[PDB]
Amino acid sequence: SLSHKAWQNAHAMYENDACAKALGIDIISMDEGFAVVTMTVTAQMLNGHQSCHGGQLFSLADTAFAYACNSQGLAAVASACTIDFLRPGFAGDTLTATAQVRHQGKQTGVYDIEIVNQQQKTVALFRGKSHR
Amino acid sequence: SLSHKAWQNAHAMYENDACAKALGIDIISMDEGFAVVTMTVTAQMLNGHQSCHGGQLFSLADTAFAYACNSQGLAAVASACTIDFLRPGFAGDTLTATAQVRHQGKQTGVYDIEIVNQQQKTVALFRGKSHRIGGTIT
Amino acid sequence: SLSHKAWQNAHAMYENDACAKALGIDIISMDEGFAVVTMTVTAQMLNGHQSCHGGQLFSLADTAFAYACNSQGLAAVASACTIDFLRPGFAGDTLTATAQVRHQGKQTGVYDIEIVNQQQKTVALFRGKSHR
Amino acid sequence: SLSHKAWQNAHAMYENDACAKALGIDIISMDEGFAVVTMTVTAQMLNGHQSCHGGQLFSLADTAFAYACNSQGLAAVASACTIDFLRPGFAGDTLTATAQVRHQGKQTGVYDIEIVNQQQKTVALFRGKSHRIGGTIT
């Protein structure tokens, strides 16, 4: 019932935590409809121009997004995502991704995620459309 | 010709692409403004629904995109892009990403990528915008 | 029944035709899941830099899209749209918008629209996500 | 100060903006990187569901966007953008589009626009990318 819903919440949280662990992502701040997580770029994530590969950035943002869904028990997947890359993230940068619900409908939602560096400059903007 | 140059560029890039090699991406087709790459979904890449993670799918699309927009010999990177996820990728699924130039100016370009599984079903649609960053490729 | 569905088709077509009329849009070619329509930019559509305003371009593309939905009886609205503007459309250009279904799900779809000028250069690319 | 300059720019542009005037757009707030504009949905703008047309909604968002990204005094145009439609706009609805800078480099910028109706419900979310085209505004 209620207890199945609670179980699903806890299950979605365990899964999100396992991906975060495996990516080296830490929760810094989290509350209703938002989450701020951090990650350090390591030399293992560099593309040929020595910056963070777009797929790690996309995961870091996906994980922040999952945590923002999960702050309110609203487990969802992304159905679409738009991303502006403004500056590269280099090895050793500490990247902070904030995700924030902007609209939550009956079946779908829109979430914005901003990734910034340790100089507080914007590395990337995402807007995602979610489903569930 | 243009296709031979496109493949030389792609061989140069792939030879030091550890993300592509780590994910098992192979390149199967190359022409100027055009690339087709391939990857098998292994269990390691799955979320809680036994479905491929977005970042792996994004990475596949971004790889066909990097090849297609670097194929003319001018180093270029993504400034922006959009992805629609249409169907899950399940373990064992073989996924083919095809990237095709829609516009290429002196500095900027637009490239459409489609990811299709072995049943010929669309998994995902991506559209990427590139920016040349100066000089020749890595 | 069937005849209600047929009536709705014909009704959606009349509406799309009235918007096209009011925008000066002509059908050039149309078939299952695609439509190619044209429009001339008039001096009444210019912004301050003397090019077509983005909202006329958006309408021209919306109308091509409606006609592509309607080619197969699949009346829909756009829920999201992404647009790259590559070159302006100037007064007197004849702009051709092609719309093409790329995916059609149970409730939703994706359509691509390209607008080109009379020199066959690309003026704008749209990708739309549709609903119905 | 910065806001006074922002409003001078906006008065200069609006004074010859016939699309804004034709659609009844008014400007109500201006600061550097920031603009709020307003419009009432009349019957003339409705589709077959008695709902505002996308192009009118797009035009409203693009107007707040043009104001916000021209507010620093450097002529700039949209190179790309994306819109999510969330709720219909019905006749009589008063719609407010607020545009806020997320990034502004020397040449390019990103601006987020939200359209809200008189019940404070979101109608639409738009994100636009701008490109400066040289010199001062029209």
Is C1-132 CATH 3.30.310.50? no
CB C116 within 8 A of CB C57: no
Q: How big is the A-D interface in CB pairs under 8 Å?
A: 33
In 3D space, the residue among B52, B40, B50, B47 whose CA is nearest the CA of residue A19 turns out to be B47
CB contact under 8 A, C103 and B86: yes
In 3D space, the residue among A128, B125, D30 whose CA is nearest the CA of residue C101 turns out to be B125
The residue type at B76: A
Give the neighbours of chain D: at least 3 Cβ pairs within 8 Å: A, B, C
Return the CA Rg of chain C.
15
Tell me, what DSSP letter sits at residue D116? E
The DSSP H or E segment spanning A67 is helix A54-70
In 3D space, the residue among D39, D36, D33, D32 whose CA is nearest the CA of residue D4 turns out to be D32
Among C84, C102, C105, select the one facing B110 at the smallest CB separation: C84
Give A43's contacts (C-beta < 8 A, 6+ positions apart).
Answer: A91
Among D77, D83, D133, select the one facing C81 at the smallest CB separation: D83
Measured over the CA atoms of residue D63, residue D67, residue D69 and residue D73, the dihedral's sign is positive
CA dist., res. B16 & res. B128, Å (int): 23
CB contact under 8 A, D125 and A110: yes
Coil/strand/helix, residue C18: helix
CB B89 within 8 A of CB B57: yes
Q: What are phi and psi of A131, to 5 degrees?
A: -130, 115
Angle between helices D54-70 and C54-70 (to 10 degrees): 150
Chain A residues within 8 A (CB-CB) of chain B? 11-12, 15, 19, 47-49, 53-56, 58-59, 62, 77-85
The residue type at D8: Q
- CA distances to A91, B14, B67 from B17, rounded to whole Å, are 17, 5, 11
- CA distances to A14, A36, A126, C6 from A99, rounded to whole Å, are 19, 6, 9, 45
Measured over the CA atoms of residue B111, residue B107, residue B69 and residue A58, the dihedral's sign is negative
Among C82, C103, C127, select the one facing B122 at the smallest CB separation: C103
CA dist., res. D45 & res. C59, Å (int): 12
Chain D residues within 8 A (CB-CB) of chain B? 80, 82, 129
Chain C residues within 8 A (CB-CB) of chain A? 80, 82, 129
CB contact under 8 A, C103 and B125: yes
- How many residues can be counted in chain C? 132
In 3D space, the residue among A131, A45, A44, A58 whose CA is nearest the CA of residue A99 turns out to be A58
Give D137's contacts (C-beta < 8 A, 6+ positions apart).
Answer: D9, D12, D13, D70, D73, D74, D75
In 3D space, the residue among C43, C64, C72, C73 whose CA is nearest the CA of residue C128 turns out to be C64
CB contact under 8 A, A80 and B81: no
CB C43 within 8 A of CB C80: no
CB D62 within 8 A of CB D128: yes
CB contact under 8 A, B78 and A54: yes
Secondary structure E strands in chain C: 26-31, 34-40, 77-85, 94-104, 108-116, 122-131
Among A103, A110, A125, select the one facing D110 at the smallest CB separation: A125
Burial of B28 by CB count in 10 Å (0-12 exposed, 13-18 middle, 19+ buried)?
exposed
- Residue D103 bridge partners (DSSP): D110
Q: Helical H runs in chain D? A: 2-15, 18-22, 54-70
Please give the full DSSP string across B42-68, using - where no structure is assigned. Answer: -GGGB-TTSBB-HHHHHHHHHHHHHHH
Measure in Å the smallest separation between the Cα of D61 and chain B Cα atoms. 20
CB A80 within 8 A of CB C80: yes
Burial of A6 by CB count in 10 Å (0-12 exposed, 13-18 middle, 19+ buried)?
exposed
Give the residue extent of every domain in chain A: 1-132
Exposed e or buried b for every residue in C9-28, given b needs 16+ CB within 10 A?
A: eeebbebbbebbeebebeee
- Residue B114 bridge partners (DSSP): B98, B125
What's the CATH architecture for D1-138?
Answer: Roll (3.10)
In a mutagenesis test of the B interface, which of A39, A46, A56, A58 is the best target, namely the one with the most B β-carbons within 10 Å? Answer: A58
In 3D space, the residue among C47, B24, D110 whose CA is nearest the CA of residue A122 turns out to be D110
Report residue B109 as tokens: 């370009």
Measure in Å the smallest separation between the Cα of D134 and chain C Cα atoms. 12
Return the CA Rg of chain A.
15
CB A49 within 8 A of CB B48: no
